[PDB]
Write a protein that binds this ligand. Structure first.
Ligand SMILES: OC[C@@H](O)[C@@H](O)[C@@H](O)CO
Ligand SMILES: OC[C@@H](O)[C@@H](O)[C@@H](O)CO
Ligand SMILES: OC[C@@H](O)[C@@H](O)[C@@H](O)CO
Ligand SMILES: [Mn+2]
Ligand SMILES: [Mn+2]
Ligand SMILES: [Mn+2]
Ligand SMILES: [Mn+2]
Lengths: 493, 490, 494
């Protein structure tokens, strides 16, 4: 779906107390690091000034704050960089911060190491004084410690940069709701205002007839063109091929796909929701059309679930677009020793989780009482994964993350007419769900194979919301205590 | 004339067996005398027995909780009524509690008063001990002190009785939203879930296609017969070749709205002008008429004001109460006043003029020239109430205003309008209103008092701020700071 | 002279939407430009920025406000309805003092004219309210001024607030130089410099008095002569203190300190400094006339290492346009029934901008510092309304305390009092203010101003996010105690 050319500003801190020539060794050391990271992290590191004064620090932050291509700031105290200088800038920095607690040389030059070296590569105490200052200001930030060349440091920096880029998409992110929330449903509700203060989301509701007229203007020739792209991608079920009568169903989806994309592109929407209780002017419920916009980059939520729509977009950004989709727990496999969750949804499951080459099928749909819709049908993949809900507790949001394991279906489901994925939640179906329910997790989630818990925890930190994680170490007792103690901490905020 | 259930108020009298069973006979006799006399002229009072045991106390409360006719409980400690007895019942009670701290005789019978009297007529301390237990439980309740025949006691119960009835309406209240919120608008947004938990409001959004289908149905028309039975018309009248399908389209909108609202049980609704697919006209004259039946309305998807209007119309007994919006100011020194209106939907029950039907263009929403009631609003003391979501909790903001007759007419203004002089001044009240965060949409009423709205906040468990003749802006900011610290969490 | 001020400007931003055409934007734009131009005829220039209509326009002007070191405050006005969720991103970014001007181009309703087009364009009655909601919902502090934009009171209030916001923009830059540490064992002059740099923006750092001693040794004796010619330009000399007199030595020393002090503080960019009599190595006198001179030029100062008051004196002087503001200390009480007064001085350092007598250079012994007889300006303070302000550290947060007072002309001369002085009558009473002051924890060091109001100090405290308590004619000690209690619960979190 294409991102801004986001970049990370690498701001090195120092002080005049060793001279202007030591300020040159620092500028050199910093440029060598930035340039050597950029030999590759699909976002360039931009080396900015060595900063030595309150004013230089304050302005790199002011500038960071304002450049929309800056998606995070990485700050490293090369020398001692007295941290009160950093206050004024740190107060203004509202882009994500990473404190790279590193060091140019990797190993203590025994036989060399004198005071001249001790005056230059003193990161070991410089970063701690800067660390104090960021803590003393209550500022959320990521802290990674190691040599700037170590392979794990880059892993952590790479993971964090993906998160910071999501954070930047989040700032802009405009969501288009096509109809209200499903009536009397609770979890898909919330304060769009608060989500806009907290996450930057503009969560935009347009009457479904705005969408209905967009899909009528769509030429039959544009439909013909997309259909050849389906042929290029997705095997068709019987009767869906251009001859069979199911094609007016497949072509309508493709028509909806074109009315939608036209609309979402005209407004700069990167996420959107539909509602089956409001489909006036529509022939079908958006299904394969929704499935495809997801795979391209859009976030979706069913039944007006703007929260998960935004969440889906955001987790697509973190995953580099891969292995991520809106999700809904639909039934359980409770077979002792083999207990599984079956995740699916009405129509809308993104093909980027597919281990089967997706296949356009067409089936009836009781819900909404509109045309028998077309939709991609496939089995979700296998491997470690995460399932994420963002909910509104009223006074604040909570992000719930279940580390799960998706499994290859042992048997077929030929009568199941929508996309399907199986997964065994950690630490068990029993405790994951109890924990999930105590946490209040929604039924809508964003399932992903590529977003790691650490990234979502890092996103929550950046946004300043609670993130609770259900994984293999989760005990329900202590998890109850986490929810009690986190609640104490997050009031006000 | 939107009807309420026959709401009743359960008088409960508390006592104990320390004085005997003929003392109880007198406690029951006094209470029936009181309830009976109050019932010779709002809503009936029902004497509900003298309760004397935890279990009798718990019973009547459970009974109150489940009686959807019970809009409030009125409790009175005729004697000492040991208050722990009351815990398990007060814990259950979820209906408005009025603690009527009263006494049967008015005077101390000096010549006669003996220990058998002070055993029996000891509300003086029994009510204080009940006082402690309700306070000790944190419970919201009204307290009214005075003789049960005292005229002022009556005015205050009648007032509280109106708030309690509105509170019961609140617990039923179902709101239909035709379209979402107007776009990028902040104050009309909020948390429908929380508002359901705090006020009992069921706020549910129907796509306007649903309301568009129900007005593709008829009764031709009978409606227009009574339009002329009520309202002046303008050129655009009946023949009115130009503009009559304007009025026949609002009349159409009115009957499909009413059919949708009466079908689903909605006493409040909202329209948004940004979703009008299938509507030839943004609703206007239709909405003003539904409001005058008692419906709550909020423009641009404003459910909180929609609900608020409903409850204030119920508090007001249908009178002088309308969706409102500060539209423009008149800063003329010494004569500063606000022009409240809305793009169409002002309820005629605030009119001091005969309502006139006009049909004028309306750019907004890009639909046909809507028909609407145009009229000048009345004068006299009033309140202007906004209810906002601060994110963690709701805030009811109430401004006492003085509505004024307009000295100059506004002959090319196509909407109904009212002028008021807000207390204590345009400059300070607006400042307070803005510090408090009050919406542009409000409920104006001539017949809801501030005390009522405050009492509703108590029932509801929310902050109520009031801007009136005694408001300083600087102390008002303190009140906001101090309230916010009390109300967060709660 | 007077300490220099960056050219500060206030940005006038006006909000509206696209639901009305391109043409209405044109009229809103002209309306604001008219209002701004008529305003510049206010203390500092107003700059009409833009009509903002989108999220990204609101955010950019806000980013530009934070960045613009010339911008002292943003003045927002919602001409029409400006859906406030648009303003979230901008308001969350804005860190400049915000005034919300709730106003209206036209003063009166055109009764014969008014129609939907007018109701669609002059919508502030609600557009500002929708904006008031969003600002309140983010918990941001702002000023809110309501009136027609030509209103005289609207101007008086905007001038007060602008003076404040320029004091705030100085506070962010503000650099304080402590020559010496706190007077040993003193509590109220202590505090958290880190917290104060985070809250108010003040950079507060210690130099050894050695750094200043050596800077005064490098003063020419030719510039010292140039300065005495300026003392003759300005100040009456007590017997034995002009050129040739026995105690004119002492004035020269205070000339030398002044010129060294000024060179240290001009070199570093410091607008406020502190000295301590317990640390005077390398100086022949505790600085005094020098300080008095420097405060007169607009420097903040606090005795005994008191950076908090030093910063406060500089800020209030900015608020007061340099006029009638001075460091102050309650020295002694006149308790006479019906004439209760406080004599307020310091041991040397009272700024002459509060003088009612023409200041007189004098030289007297001073036990305190252990150094030579210090020269100093001596005068009787003027009379009238004034505020006495103190900023203290409660440990977890700052508290601004402001007493309204009425300065009085001395009825009886004080011939054997070697220091400048002022006499004031604290509202509502001496016994009640001192009680409320002591309960508030007021320092003995104050900043005293004839030209700073309480509403300005409150506005300053609102901008910084700190508690301000005012002691004046309406203050009763029982309700004051409750204010302190209830304020504490509010200010604990934040
Ligand atoms: O500028 C800092 C300095 O060089 C050393 O960090 C200190 O002396 C010891 O921390
Ligand atoms: O005569 C009843 C009487 O009310 C009680 O026994 C006590 O005074 C309450 O302490
Ligand atoms: O909410 C303000 C008012 O109701 C309307 O939004 C304006 O007239 C048109 O935006
Ligand atoms: Mn669903
Ligand atoms: Mn409106
Ligand atoms: Mn909320
Ligand atoms: Mn002192």
């Amino acid at each position: 779906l294409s991102l801004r050319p986001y970049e990370f500003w690498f701001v090195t801190g120092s002080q005049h107390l060793y001279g202007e020539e030591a300020l040159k060794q620092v500028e050199e050391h910093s440029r060598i690091m930035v340039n050597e990271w950029n030999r590759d992290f699909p976002f360039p590191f931009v080396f900015k000034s060595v900063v030595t004064t309150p004013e230089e620090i304050r302005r790199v932050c002011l500038e960071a704050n304002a450049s929309e291509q800056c998606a995070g700031v990485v700050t490293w105290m090369h020398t001692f960089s007295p941290a009160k200088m950093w206050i004024g800038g740190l107060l203004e920095l509202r882009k994500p911060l990473l404190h790279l607690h590193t060091q140019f040389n990797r190993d203590i030059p025994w036989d060399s190491i004198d005071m001249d070296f001790m005056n230059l590569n003193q990161s070991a105490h410089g970063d701690r004084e800067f660390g104090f200052m960021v803590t003393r200001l209550g500022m959320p930030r990521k802290v990674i410690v190691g040599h700037w060349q170590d392979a794990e440091v880059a892993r952590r920096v790479r993971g964090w940069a993906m998160t910071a880029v999501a954070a930047a998409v989040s700032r802009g992110l405009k969501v288009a709701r096509f109809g209200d929330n499903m009536r009397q449903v609770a979890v898909t509700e919330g304060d769009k205002v608060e989500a806009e203060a907290r996450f930057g989301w503009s969560v935009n509701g347009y009457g479904v007839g705005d969408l209905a007229e967009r899909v009528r203007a769509v030429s039959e020739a544009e439909i013909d063109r997309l259909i050849d792209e389906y042929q290029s991608l997705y095997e068709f079920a019987p009767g869906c091929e251009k001859g069979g009568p199911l094609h007016d169903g497949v072509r309508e989806q493709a028509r909806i796909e074109l009315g939608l994309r036209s609309f979402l592109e005209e407004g700069g929407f990167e996420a959107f929701t539909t509602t089956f209780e409001d489909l006036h002017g529509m022939k079908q419920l958006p299904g394969l059309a929704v499935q495809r916009l997801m795979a391209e980059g859009y976030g979706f939520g069913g039944e007006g679930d703007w929260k998960t729509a935004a969440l889906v977009r955001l987790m697509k950004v973190m995953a580099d677009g891969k292995g991520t989709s809106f999700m809904e727990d639909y039934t359980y496999h409770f077979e002792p020793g083999n207990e599984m969750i079956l995740g699916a949804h009405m129509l809308e499951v993104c093909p980027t989780i597919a281990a089967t080459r997706p296949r356009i099928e067409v089936h009836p749909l009781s819900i909404g009482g509109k045309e028998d819709p077309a939709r991609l049908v496939f089995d979700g993949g296998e491997g470690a994964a995460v399932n994420a809900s963002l909910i509104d507790l009223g006074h604040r949001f909570r992000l719930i993350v279940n580390e799960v394991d998706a499994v290859k279906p042992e048997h077929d489901m030929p009568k199941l007419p929508v996309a399907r994925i199986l997964w065994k939640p950690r630490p068990s179906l029993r405790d994951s769900a109890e924990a999930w329910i105590l946490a209040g997790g929604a039924h809508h989630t964003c399932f992903s194979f590529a977003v790691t818990t650490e990234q979502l925890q890092d996103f929550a930190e950046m946004a300043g919301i609670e993130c609770v994680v259900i994984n293999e170490h989760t005990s329900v007792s202590s998890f109850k205590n986490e929810l009690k103690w986190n609640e104490v901490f997050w009031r006000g905020r």
